[PDB]
From a paper:
[name] also serves as a receptor for [name] ([name]), which is the most toxic protein and has paradoxically emerged as a potent reagent for therapeutic and cosmetic applications.
In addition to the monomeric [name]–HCA2–LEV complex, we also obtained the cryo-EM reconstruction of the dimeric assembly of the [name]–HCA2–LEV complex to 2.90 Å resolution, in which two [name]–HCA2–LEV complexes are assembled through the LD4–LD4 interaction, positioning two [name] TMDs in a near perpendicular configuration. The cryo-EM structure of the dimeric assembly of the [name]–HCA2–LEV complex is formed through the LD4–LD4 interaction, in which the open edge of the β-strand from each LD4 forms an anti-parallel β-sheet. The association of LD4 may contribute to accumulating the glycans to form a gel matrix.
Numbering used by the authors:
A (entry chain A): 137 to 403, 418 to 742
B (entry chain B), D (entry chain D): 876 to 1295
C (entry chain C): 477 to 586
The structure:
């Protein structure tokens, strides 16, 4: 039984390769390439939105700690769920159908997230958008792979990873061109407010609907039809491919010579259908861990987890340490004023980055003053008067207030740390969040710039991989790029300034992209068409879980030491390279 | 059934009961000008009230149950000196045996001590961290009952607060004289106010206690926030009981301007002592007599008065346009000669139809004696304006829970100590 | 002129100690002040008059003043560096151990 | 011919004259480290010097003329407590008869008292409001002569200042002991310095006193502004005598930068006590020994040394390009190693060819021992630049008045009291 099935599968694969060779490469392949590139650009865009809008969403939504982190990390959980779900579903419902469903879910919930005002609702909408976009990469690659002959498969697949960086640069550009306009305060309903970051969210949701519009005009993969016992329409899709290719070439007169194609023989209602779908989806998932594929699957798990952990940990680590260096430089420039008596003086002033220690203020009035990162310590205020006071990162530690009045100020009770108030009155307090939120100005711009550089760093290596994918091989390029990634991880010690870390981030980003391209190609060619999408989706979900783990671990280690991240990244990358070097070679074979 | 009842008379304090207990008053004991029947005791040695009963009514039994009742007004505690400073206000012990009423920071304590020096304590505790309190600087009706067989109970404003068994106590002796002075208070600026002290030779039940509370409440006279008498020509800040976190404010002068409830109120804080809310926020309401023939300044029930409104230290007048859309029509403050024939007569209501005492309310009525209705508040596009409607009267007739037709009058008080 | 004199502010009994300053003042009279170990760097003073004041161990740098006077003022151990506070701007004043350095160019009178 | 001559020796003070006057000193008398022969007297009781002469030399005659000489250094008077505070520094009065020298605010007074209580006073007055003084905190050579028949005269640095007839005075007695102590000073932080006290039993003429001044001036030793000894490795501010309102300053580092005279100087004022000019302005000129074989740090005449300039607390070196346009060529300060063969040697000159003492001058010379000439200042485009040229030597040869070749060295001193 198994021998007959294997022989039938081999015959089908060989005849499909012959048919694809007869059809050839041409306009249809490039059109599908651009459509699936839009689909992948949606995924590339999706990963920057919350990171770019967090500085505004914290003020506009009163975000504390453990809410910024979960908001940042929720997109990866969404894709972890979505990749597995849509990968399992696509092998039974079709590549194009599940791609349409997932992209529609992504578009709808990304549109909804732009108008949501709460935090839990925003979390839910963003998690569902991540679920929708999680199934893009597995389905896109396993769908484009079934229209390529064995002659040039590595290069034609590796050219498809350009669109991820394209989406990254698009997100960075629109973040630069939309977010900084804090003035925009469009008002639709008194209790609600719409700022520029919601416009940025909408514009970032646009490429997904563009991808859906492009995908609506493409045919399903003939291999999926052939595996499911569905013959005629697979033949029509191959005929369409051949006709389009030959009409584009300039010979619209030859005839599709293929007449018969070998086909795999096939051997309350809603509940039954759902139960059956779960049934053979679980069957495909388990047969991925079968006797024929159990070593290969474990190598895939190891390589995917290691590279995802290292890459995502370092990618989230670099900007965090840039921020830490900026913060330490800011704390270097702090002025200190020890001992200060001011009596019977009226005031307006603006103070930034100062520490007033042991002051004595009696019968002063502080009318209309702004305080950025100003700390008053061990001070004594007696019969003072505060009015029109605005304060960011301002605290009153160890201070004593006697018979003082706080009129029209934003001095909320969290700014009085270990302070003592006696007979003090708060009147007409300004509107504000119960906790502290940080405002970012031009500091956002550089962030966007840095992000752009990272995406640009990806640009060279892609081309190199795209030019050598078939020439050297999948295993060699994977191991070679992992080796330079480990070396770059070791070289992290020689950097302690912002420019140095920008250069280091660019170097690592430009080095690891060849490894990622080779891993994508190897994952595509290592599985037969009846579990390609299931296995790819499972491995992508593993990648997203490793991304979550690496992000948490590497963000926990910022400002402590620079030996834990280097050690972790180098160990993980060495393990991944070692596990990748012991894989089978698929450079020349029939897709099976 | 009353043994002692200290009441005011012509420049002295007498006893309503037929026992003629001797009374001695110190030279620094004060009286309120309007309500002289309430007595102020300060923290000095000469501020003392002595009441000497007869030998036939001195508590010296063991099976004898007895009760006491009074009204007390305690100012706010302002600093940490008042903390852990249990001080006696009413003393009736002798040879370490008797009953004693004392006050601590946010506490009213009743103590019984027998001849065996066994101490029983019943405590009413009120918080000083509340936004708006019913006990801080406000008149409280305290009643204490002591049944020697079962328990000893305390009642604050007619409702039970605490009950401690006293069956273990033996014979309790009592002094021939009763004290009224602040004994053992370290604060030199700490005083109390007390009125209507009564003693009974039996344990009073709930019915008698509510009857006494209602009788001594003077339900026919309007009361302000602190519980005193309401007076004409005095500025009062205004508080809505259903919405106590917003104060009355105005935006523009005239019919085109509307009075509304702006919020939230601020706070007055002394760390680890009090975190109250500001009561001196908003626009003051002055009351002017129109048809009341009474010579005194005290506002009574069913009085027909006018309401001036103090904006920027200028007195305007309450009025509304009777003929407009809906029943819930907007009230406004306008120049006093501009009023013309606008509905400006208001009737002050304290007790309901049955005579049950409730909070102050205002009934706007026209020149024709037609009830526009009770003055309240309603929300139009998220702004709560003062509206005079008969909907409140409809709910009163249906015995339904009215929303926003009850007000409170807060004048500046020295026991509150909030800076204006 | 008379209207200008009407809008003049007056600040009595003003104590400042160990404070650094830049400010621009116009049409003010500060009476009975007490300044100790204050540094006054780069201040513009138009029609500002200090009366009955006391400056002790103070420091003035880059001070420019038009129609500014120090009448009934006492200076102790103070340093005037890069200032145009010439000798006609101290009316019935007492300087003690005070140093004038790098005086700005200006006319001998107002 | 001298009767008393107090001269320093090995950790003591001796008398050069052959009379063996007893000398005793206190435990609080201080001595300068470099110039021990000068003695510091502070306002205390133990700061005392007693010198006892012999009975054969005690002044007890009436026709006996006598004179004395000394060097005195008086710091600046800082506060009003020094006004009208006439205090005695040297007293020889017993039984209200004798001679006494004393100091007042800007005053040095010589007083003679006979047995008939008659007082004769000779006063030298120096102002304290001058911009640059020759007497404030600077060494002053003070002598008096007393001819009992004609007059009594005061000489400051060898010049007549005041004279007063003393013919009316009778017999003047003198004490057997002479006192060196500040007596009658209300200022607790007041001190003086004194040195080279000599006494003569006749009235000295102009020639002898000028010879004494020249002999004790130490004309072969360099002197700074205060009159002390010039020393190496000590920062000195620069003063031009003919242009005393400007100080040496730099603009750029190297040959391209020029050292010029910037003005005007500041002032130090204490409201009717002093209105002096600031002497702590400019750049400091350190002196480094090059070929002087003397072990001590004192700078002598005809010494060949180098000059460092302190710019932003960094020491540069004097140099000029020997070969360029004109003789009035520009001097500059450059980094210490980068001089190369540029002329650096400067010869210190204090006494002239004939031996007459004059103020300090610096003579720039090359490595070949060719005289570039005396360092001076010349005006290029209204800017006074430091120029070394032989024109000053040409005027010296012609016995003309040189213009710009004289300098004064001002170190930081505690007798001036200016904040730096
Ligand atoms: C806290 O304040 C109370 C009330 O005083 C008022 O509120 C203050 C904030 C301030 O504005 C005062 O000027 C107000 O009068 C103080 O208690 C009263 O203090 C005054 C002295 O100013 C005294 O005459 C009263 O008798 C006091 N009243 C009582 C009931 O004690 C209190 O002393 C203040 N606390 C401190 C630590 O100063
Ligand atoms: C005026 O100053 C003199 C000199 O002191 C210096 O100048 C001051 C302006 C200031 O910068 C000081 O730190 C300088 O040291 C004072 O006279 C001396 O005062 C010091 C006390 O610091 C004392 O130790 C010395 O013995 C004093 N010397 C003499 C000769 O008296 C003087 O006291 C100052 N006057 C006033 C009123 O403060
Ligand atoms: C200073 O504060 C006052 C009151 O808040 C305001 O009127 C004035 O414009 C302020 N000045 C500046 C320069 O911000
Ligand atoms: C600051 O806090 C310390 C203890 O934390 C206390 O001893 C000190 O008194 C405080 N400062 C002042 C000015 O009281
Ligand atoms: C205040 O003075 C300082 C020092 O002179 C100067 O640098 C600064 O620019 C001044 N500020 C303004 C607003 O002129
Ligand atoms: C101001 O002048 C008066 C007399 O003109 C004087 O009594 C007073 O002391 C002066 N002010 C001060 C602070 O000395
Ligand atoms: C589409 C590219 C994708 C992949 N599956 O390889 N990449 C590349 C870097 C991180 C990532 O998820």
């Amino acid at each position: 039984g198994e021998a007959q099935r294997r022989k039938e599968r081999e015959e089908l694969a060989q005849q499909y390769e012959a048919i694809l060779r007869e059809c050839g490469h041409g306009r249809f392949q490039w059109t599908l390439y651009f459509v699936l590139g839009l689909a992948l650009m949606a995924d590339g865009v999706e990963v920057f939105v919350v990171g770019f809008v967090l500085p505004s969403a914290e003020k506009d939504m009163c975000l504390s700690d453990s809410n910024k982190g979960m908001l940042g990390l929720i997109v990866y959980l969404g894709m972890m769920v979505g990749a597995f779900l849509w990968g399992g579903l696509a092998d039974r419902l079709g590549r194009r159908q599940c791609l349409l469903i997932s992209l529609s879910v992504n578009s709808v919930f990304a549109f909804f997230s732009s108008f949501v005002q709460g935090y839990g609702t925003f979390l839910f909408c963003r998690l569902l958008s991540g679920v929708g976009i999680g199934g893009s990469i597995p389905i896109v690659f396993s769908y484009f792979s079934e229209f390529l002959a064995q002659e040039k498969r590595g290069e034609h697949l590796s050219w498809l990873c350009m669109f991820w960086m394209i989406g990254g640069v698009y997100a960075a550009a629109m973040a630069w061109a939309i977010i900084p306009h804090y003035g925009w305060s469009f008002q639709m309903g008194s209790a609600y407010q719409f700022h520029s970051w919601r416009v940025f969210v909408l514009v970032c949701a646009f490429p997904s609907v563009f991808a859906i519009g492009a995908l609506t005009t493409q045919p399903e993969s003939p291999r999926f039809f052939l595996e499911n016992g569905k013959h005629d329409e697979a033949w029509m899709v191959l005929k369409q491919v051949h006709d389009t290719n030959m009409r584009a070439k300039g010979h619209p007169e030859r005839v599709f010579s293929v007449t018969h194609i070998k086909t795999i023989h096939q051997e309350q209602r809603w509940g039954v259908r759902a139960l059956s779908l779960g049934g053979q989806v679980w069957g495909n998932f388990l047969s991925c861990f079968g006797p024929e594929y159990r070593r290969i699957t474990l190598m895939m798990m190891g390589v995917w987890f290691t590279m995802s952990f290292s890459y995502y940990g370092l990618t989230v680590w670099f900007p965090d340490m840039i921020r830490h260096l900026q913060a330490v430089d800011y704390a270097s420039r702090t002025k200190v004023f020890p001992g200060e008596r001011v009596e019977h003086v009226t005031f307006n002033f603006t103070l930034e980055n100062q520490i007033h220690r042991g002051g004595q203020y009696f019968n002063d009035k502080f009318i209309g003053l702004r305080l950025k990162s100003v700390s008053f310590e061990d001070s004594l205020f007696e019969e003072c008067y505060f009015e029109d006071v605005t304060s960011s990162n301002t605290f009153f530690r160890n201070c004593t207030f006697i018979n003082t009045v706080f009129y029209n100020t934003d001095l909320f009770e969290y700014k009085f740390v270990n302070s003592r108030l006696i007979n003090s009155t708060f009147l007409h307090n300004k509107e504000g969040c119960p906790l502290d939120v940080t405002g970012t100005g031009e500091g956002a711009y550089m962030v966007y710039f840095v992000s752009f550089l990272g995406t640009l760093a990806v640009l060279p290596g892609n081309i190199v991989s795209a030019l050598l994918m078939d020439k050297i091989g999948r295993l060699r390029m994977l191991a070679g790029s992992s080796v330079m990634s480990c070396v770059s991880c070791f070289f992290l010690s020689f950097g302690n300034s912002e420019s140095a870390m920008i250069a280091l981030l660019c170097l690592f980003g430009g080095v690891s992209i060849a490894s990622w391209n080779a891993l994508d190609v190897l994952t595509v060619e290592l599985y037969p068409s009846d579990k390609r999408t299931t296995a790819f989706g499972f491995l992508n979900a593993l990648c997203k879980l490793a991304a979550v783990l690496g992000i948490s671990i590497f963000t926990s280690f910022v400002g402590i030491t620079k030996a834990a991240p280097i050690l972790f990244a180098s160990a993980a990358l060495a393990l991944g390279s070692s596990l990748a070097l012991k894989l089978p070679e698929t450079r020349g074979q029939v897709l099976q | 059934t009353s043994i002692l009842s200290i009441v005011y008379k012509k420049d002295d304090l007498i006893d309503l009961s037929r026992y003629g207990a001797k009374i001695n008053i110190g030279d620094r004991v004060y009286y309120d000008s309007i309500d002289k029947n309430q007595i102020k005791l300060i923290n000095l040695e000469s501020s003392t009230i002595e009441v000497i009963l007869k030998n036939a009514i001195v508590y010296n039994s063991m099976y004898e149950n007895f009760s006491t009742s009074f009204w007390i007004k305690i100012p706010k505690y302002f600093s940490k000196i008042n903390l852990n400073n249990e001080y006696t206000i009413i003393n009736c012990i002798e040879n370490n045996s008797g009953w004693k009423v004392s006050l601590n920071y946010g506490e009213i304590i009743w103590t019984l001590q027998d001849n065996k020096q066994n101490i029983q304590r019943v405590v009413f505790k009120y918080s000083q961290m509340v936004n708006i309190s019913d006990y801080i600087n406000r008149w409280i009706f305290v009643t204490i009952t002591n049944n020697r067989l079962t328990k000893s109970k305390i009642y604050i404003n007619g409702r039970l607060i605490d009950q401690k068994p006293i069956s273990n106590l033996g014979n309790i002796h009592a002094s021939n004289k009763i004290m009224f002075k602040l004994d053992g208070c370290r604060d030199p600026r700490r005083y109390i106010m007390i009125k209507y002290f009564n003693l009974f030779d039996k344990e009073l039940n709930e019915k008698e206690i509510k009857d006494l509370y209602d009788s001594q409440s003077n339900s026919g006279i309007l009361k302000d926030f602190w519980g005193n008498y309401l007076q004409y020509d005095k500025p009062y800040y205004m508080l809505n009981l259903f919405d106590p976190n917003k104060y009355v404010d105005v935006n523009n002068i005239g019919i085109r301007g509307y009075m509304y409830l702006k919020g939230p109120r601020g706070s007055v804080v002394t760390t680890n002592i009090y975190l109250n809310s500001t009561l001196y926020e908003g626009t003051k309401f002055i009351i002017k007599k129109y048809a009341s023939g009474n010579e005194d300044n005290i506002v009574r029930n069913n009085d027909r008065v006018y309401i001036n409104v103090v904006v920027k230290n200028k007195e305007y007048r309450l009025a509304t346009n009777a003929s407009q859309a809906g029943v819930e029509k907007i009230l406004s403050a306008l120049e006093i000669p501009d009023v013309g024939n606008l509905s400006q007569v208001v009737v002050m209501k304290s007790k309901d139809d049955q005579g049950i005492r409730n909070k102050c309310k205002m009934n706007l009525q026209d020149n024709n004696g037609n009830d526009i209705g009770f003055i309240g508040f309603h929300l139009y596009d998220n702004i709560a304006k003062l509206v005079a409607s008969n909907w409140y009267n409809r709910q009163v007739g249906k015995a339904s829970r009215t929303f926003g037709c009850s007000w409170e009058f807060i004048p500046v008080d020295d026991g509150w100590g909030e800076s204006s």
